[PDB]
């Protein structure tokens, strides 16, 4: 009788996954003119 044993290595298996997300943000409004240069009263003529 021997009963003699052996020894191995520590083998482990795992599944890893990292995830993320996305969101789009928008801000708009109906045009009521716009930032202009030389905002002055005018007198058009044809």
């Amino acid at each position: 009788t021997r009963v003699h044993s052996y020894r191995g290595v520590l083998i482990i298996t795992d599944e890893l996954t990292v995830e993320a997300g996305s969101r789009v943000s928008l801000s708009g409004y109906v045009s009521d003119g716009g930032t202009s240069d030389v905002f002055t009263i005018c007198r058009l003529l044809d």
Binding site: D32, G33, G34, T35, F39, I41, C42
Partner: protein, 52 residues
């Protein structure tokens, strides 16, 4: 407040009760005929004649 210049007839007289506290509402119409936002303008001055 048309920016292009407005029947001419005779302009009406705005009547504020003496005392009390009125809030003058000026609406900026862009110079075709459209409301415009209060943009560009960084200073606005009321200059009631020879008063203040």
């Amino acid at each position: 407040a048309p920016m292009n210049g407005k029947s001419n007839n005779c302009n009406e007289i705005v009547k504020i009760p003496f005392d009390s506290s009125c809030l003058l509402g000026v609406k900026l119409y862009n110079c075709e005929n459209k409301r415009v936002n209060v943009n560009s303008v960084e200073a606005a001055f009321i200059t009631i004649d020879t008063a203040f």
